[PDB]
């Protein structure tokens, strides 16, 4: 029972036709008896055979490809996610109660297209271009391709831009760069929302003094969370006015899955952008392991293959190459730059998550916020010990570079001896005072929610616990004893550290004198 | 003849024929594409049917295209004209320098070198690393394995390695870079240009590398034959030319990865915690292709990330069996603040033996690991009791091991750029009797951190003199210092006039190219006739 035998039922051998002859008669009475009874023959179209939940499986369409955007008869858009043989497995855009067994499903050959510009910034879309902040559609914008593969290697350079997020705990401990792929990877209600707004509040702050070549935009992509959350950071944009530098797509957990699978691929496709014609770009790519469970939602209806965790076999394909495309170009493409924030929530404390152990590979530094560190004081609750980065030098501030070596190394000794107090030591003068060095250190180095503070403030903050003017301080007062050191210094010798950058012996004798100028309430 | 494209499901494609089916590991080829398609058949469907794998994105591939035959396996150009160039999977300049000035295009998939051509005589590679070439010598022509996790520091040893080894060799060596990030791709194209390995001009012909770059933003056809790729081009220079190159392949296990994220998608249930049910003849198969035979000298380097510190995944667990230098970076040693921070216990080669070496450097790698298991199994007491009960015996084998962690410490040439400190190049036997010194207690005199980030025994005295002044310096806090105003220092004013004026525009450019066209406010559908048209008004 083979195909040659097959071939072999291809050559007639009937030997007779006593059917043949009235069968073609009757034929033709019998399709048009029962004619209103056949839907038409369709080939470059579609029509549905299974619909439900957000994949809809479509008979015909002999002309689609792999992700062409596809539209239901009911104005509903969609996606060909796979094409299996007699059929085309259709990813559903949105609710999909409207579409029926037998349903025209109209091809319209492109590839899945967001609108892109900067008529958006100010603009709230979801991941599909739809606008849903009431201003009515976007203006002065255009078409880009969502599916497009990252910059190659010789469109890259070295990172040299620091990207201030205007957070001591970050740009001290931490190095960002300007084409660096930080992660935001920690608990749930642990501040990582908190460090990515204080990033864009501070680049907006910032945006209106830089001269138009280290202006970084921001698009925040808002996977999953509620939509009193989104108006409520659309709130927070507006009443500092940061929306004028601020686009947001914002996929919310009631939409179906490919708009929420769609939403950081579409906030990417903004900010290349950005990064094409030269200028700086902000991206961060919150609840991106809500992302992966809205890739999860879509294969388990798919009939494709599950594996750890029930995730699919391409998912760390899906987290690279949504941070392939952020980068710093070279200088033949105008210079512009990427930097990259995503979001990763760990299982209550499961750094080998299937969905961690991706993206703590792919990424270049970081920045576990345990809930452990959010309780004893130290907001926001970054962990010092276990967050890297690449670049380190020439990805800070370099005035705060030569005294991050100062923070960081005794940094690393406090946490040794931190666990050591079952006992009460304290002995030789060491034990204690590196005790009572990273104490204040602590003390030091915890801010305000939704406070960003510039860089050029932070580098003489740096230096209160670094050299003396401390020495004889609690540590229940820094926190209130530090914003007078703000206070009673010139405010106007911040202006020429930030005009300077560095740390000259020039500007050396005045920071030593001004914070002994200072008086601190810690008594 | 030819075939068409009959299924497409995400990163794997069906291809059909009518007769004369392709043989197994052919490449394949669509036209009408936006770049060359390479598919790459891993099993026959059954159906007159081959099943494929992409070495690019399938976005856009529709059901029915012309697929032709290439009749043969994929095909690179081999030669050495390609040092100096950037490579791809399928034999791609993607460097943007002309084509590759080569010839003799070979076949990369292969069997492996078989039993009676191996090599069993065995040099000690001193790379210069003073926990390397003590602890794990590695092997001339042998195998060098690279573990840890997703932060420790593995591939900036690598980097560091080539510029131990890479550059001193004068011959020819290959970078492999399977899986990784574009940043420490890129990074690694300047600091070759600058180090002169590869060059620009008409000196193309005498640099000393090629670059074969499979990084994370491929899909999966492509980060899982690039190890491959990179592989058959240094067994080009194996056997017809018979230089020595040094293989520097990035991230095995994104090779392992890439076949496991597409061998359920080809029909094939999920192995052990859901890794490939064929890994073993995967990575087995690429392990022993990379040896060194009687005619030339292949020297394996091996980086391979392991998920969160955990060597029961068998991803990494069929790896230990495939790598005799192995080099075991732990967090824990990069937690202390310790670059670099290779095991002392985990990382062990196969050159540790006193039959080949020599037994004065045997005897202190294992005097290194009797001082520092003990340390292992005594930091877990010292938290009980606090080092004060021991009677002067076991104060010994411990102080001397708090100072043993600190000399497996470096500066490296490559981590300069950010750790400010100069990197050494280290011999073998000016550290095995330094090593040894402070093992015997020659150099119990001296304080802790003397012995971090240092080199030779000339440097570990020199750090303490320059600390032991340094505690006699800052003893002063009166006068005459850099806090008055008497000697050089301007007002807090005159600082100001200096400034550069900065302009802010307010515009901030942004409408210069930008065609702002206008977009549909009703999709835009086809009929069945294939032409444009607005959507038919009918549910
Ligand atoms: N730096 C901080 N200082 C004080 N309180 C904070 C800080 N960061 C977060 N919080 C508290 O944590 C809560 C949640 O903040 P945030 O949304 O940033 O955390 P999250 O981990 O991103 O939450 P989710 O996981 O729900 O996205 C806030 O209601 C706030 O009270
Ligand atoms: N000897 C060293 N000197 C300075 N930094 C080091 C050294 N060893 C490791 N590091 C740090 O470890 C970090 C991780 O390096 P990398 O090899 O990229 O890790 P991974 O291989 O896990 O991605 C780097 O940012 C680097 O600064
Ligand atoms: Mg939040």
Not at chain 2, 509 to 523: I, M, V
Request: hydrophobic content about 40%.
């Amino acid at each position: 029972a083979d195909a040659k035998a097959l071939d072999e039922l291809r050559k007639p051998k009937f030997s007779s036709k006593y059917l043949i002859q009235h069968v073609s008669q009757k034929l033709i009475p019998a399709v048009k008896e029962w004619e209103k009874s056949y839907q038409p023959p369709v080939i470059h179209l579609g029509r549905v055979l299974s619909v439900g939940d957000g994949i809809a499986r479509v008979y015909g369409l002999k002309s689609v490809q792999a992700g062409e955007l596809v539209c239901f008869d009911s104005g509903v858009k969609g996606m060909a996610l796979n094409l299996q043989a007699d059929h085309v497995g259709v990813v559903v855009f949105g609710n999909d109660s409207v579409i029926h067994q037998g349903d025209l499903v109209y091809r319209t050959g492109q590839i899945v297209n967001v609108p892109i510009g900067p008529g958006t910034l100010g603009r709230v879309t979801d991941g599909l271009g739809q606008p849903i902040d009431g201003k009515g559609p976007l203006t002065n914008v255009r078409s880009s391709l969502v599916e497009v593969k990252a910059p190659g290697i010789i469109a890259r350079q070295s990172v040299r831009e620091p990207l201030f997020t205007g957070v001591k705990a970050v740009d001290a401990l931490v190095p960002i760069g300007r084409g660096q792929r930080e992660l935001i990877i920690g608990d749930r209600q642990t501040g990582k929302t908190a460090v990515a707004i204080d990033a864009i509040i501070h680049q907006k702050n910032c945006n209106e003094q830089v001269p138009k070549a280290q202006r970084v935009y921001c698009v925040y992509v808002a996977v999953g969370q509620k939509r009193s959350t989104v108006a409520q950071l659309v709130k927070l944009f507006t009443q500092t006015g940061a929306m004028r530098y601020t686009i947001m797509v914002s996929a919310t957990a009631s939409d179906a899955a490919p708009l929420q699978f769609l939403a950081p691929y579409s906030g990417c496709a903004m900010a290349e952008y950005f990064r094409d014609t030269g200028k700086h770009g902000l991206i961060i790519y919150d609840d991106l392991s809500k992302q992966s469970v809205a890739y999860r939602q879509m294969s388990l209806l798919l009939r494709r293959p599950p594996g750890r965790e029930a995730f699919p076999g391409d998912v760390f394909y899906l987290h690279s190459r949504l941070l392939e495309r952020a980068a710093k170009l070279s200088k033949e493409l105008g210079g512009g730059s990427l930097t990259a924030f995503p979001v990763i929530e760990t299982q209550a404390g499961d750094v080998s998550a299937y969905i961690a152990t991706n993206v703590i590979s792919i990424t270049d530094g970081q920045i576990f916020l345990e809930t452990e560190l959010f309780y004893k004081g130290i907001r926001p609750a970054l962990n010092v010990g276990l967050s890297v980065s690449r670049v380190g030098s020439a990805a800070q501030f370099p005035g705060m570079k030569q005294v991050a070596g100062t923070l960081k190394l005794e940094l690393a000794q406090y946490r040794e001896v931190a666990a050591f107090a079952q006992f009460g030591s304290d002995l030789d003068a060491a034990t204690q005072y590196v005790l009572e060095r990273g104490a204040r250190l602590t003390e030091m180095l915890k801010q305000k929610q939704f406070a960003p503070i510039p860089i050029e403030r932070q580098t003489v903050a740096v230096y209160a616990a670094t050299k003396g003017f401390l020495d004889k301080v609690r540590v229940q007062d820094i926190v209130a004893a530090e914003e007078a050191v703000i206070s009673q210094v010139n405010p106007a010798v911040f202006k020429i550290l930030k005009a300077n950058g560095k740390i000259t012996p020039a500007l050396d004798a005045h920071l030593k004198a001004e914070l002994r100028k200072v008086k601190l309430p810690g008594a | 003849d030819a075939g068409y494209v009959s299924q497409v499901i995400g990163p794997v494609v069906d291809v059909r024929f009518d007769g004369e089916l392709p043989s197994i590991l052919s490449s394949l080829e669509v036209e009408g594409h936006s770049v060359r398609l390479v598919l790459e058949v891993a099993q026959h469907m059954g159906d007159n049917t081959v099943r494929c794998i992409a070495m690019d994105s399938t976005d856009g591939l529709v059901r029915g295209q012309k697929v032709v035959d290439t009749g043969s396996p994929i095909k690179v150009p081999v030669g050495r004209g390609t040092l100096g160039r950037i490579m791809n999977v399928i034999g791609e300049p993607v460097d943007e320098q002309g084509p590759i000035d080569a010839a003799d295009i070979w076949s990369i998939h292969r069997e492996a070198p078989e039993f009676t051509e191996q090599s069993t005589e065995q040099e000690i590679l001193v790379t210069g690393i003073k926990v390397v070439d003590l602890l794990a010598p590695y092997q001339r022509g042998g195998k060098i394995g690279l573990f840890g996790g997703a932060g420790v520091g593995k591939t900036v040893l690598i980097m560091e390695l080539i510029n131990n080894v890479a550059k001193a060799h004068g011959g020819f060596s290959v970078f492999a870079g399977v899986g990784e990030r574009t940043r420490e791709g890129n990074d690694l194209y300047r600091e070759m240009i600058e180090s002169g390995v590869i060059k620009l001009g008409a000196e193309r012909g005498n640099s000393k590398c090629t670059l074969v770059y499979g990084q994370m933003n491929e899909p999966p056809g492509a980060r899982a034959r690039v190890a491959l790729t990179g592989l058959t081009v240094a067994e080009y220079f194996r056997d017809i030319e018979g230089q020595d190159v040094l293989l520097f392949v990035d991230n095995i296990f994104r090779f392992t990865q890439a076949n496991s994220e597409v061998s359920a998608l080809l029909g094939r249930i999920p192995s052990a915690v859901g890794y490939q049910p064929t890994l073993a003849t995967d990575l087995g198969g690429l392990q022993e292709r990379i040896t060194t035979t009687t005619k030339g000298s292949i020297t394996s380097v091996q980086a391979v990330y392991v998920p969160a510190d955990d060597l029961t995944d068998p991803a990494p667990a069929t790896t230990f069996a495939h790598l005799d230098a192995t080099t075991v970076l732990s967090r824990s040693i990069a937690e202390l603040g310790i670059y670099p921070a290779v095991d002392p216990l985990d990382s062990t080669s196969r050159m540790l033996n006193p039959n080949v070496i020599g037994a004065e450097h045997y005897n202190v790698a294992r005097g290194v690991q009797k001082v520092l298991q003990d340390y292992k199994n005594l930091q877990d007491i010292i938290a009980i009791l606090g080092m004060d009960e021991l009677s002067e015996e076991d104060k010994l084998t411990v102080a001397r091991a708090r100072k043993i962690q600190r000399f497996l410490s470096q500066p490296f040439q490559v981590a300069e750029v950010f750790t400010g400190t100069p990197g050494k190049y280290v011999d073998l036997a000016d550290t095995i009797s330094g090593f040894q010194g402070v093992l015997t207690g020659k150099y119990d005199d001296l304080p802790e951190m003397a012995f971090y980030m240092v080199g030779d025994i000339k440097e570990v005295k020199e750090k303490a003199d320059k600390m032991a002044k340094d505690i006699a310096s800052r003893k002063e806090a009166d006068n005459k210092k850099v806090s008055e105003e008497l000697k050089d220092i301007p007002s807090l004013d005159k600082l100001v006039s200096e400034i550069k004026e900065v302009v802010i525009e307010e515009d901030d450019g942004l409408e210069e190219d930008f065609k702002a066209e206008a977009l549909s406010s009703e999709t835009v559908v086809l009929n069945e006739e294939g032409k444009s048209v607005p959507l038919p008004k009918k549910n």
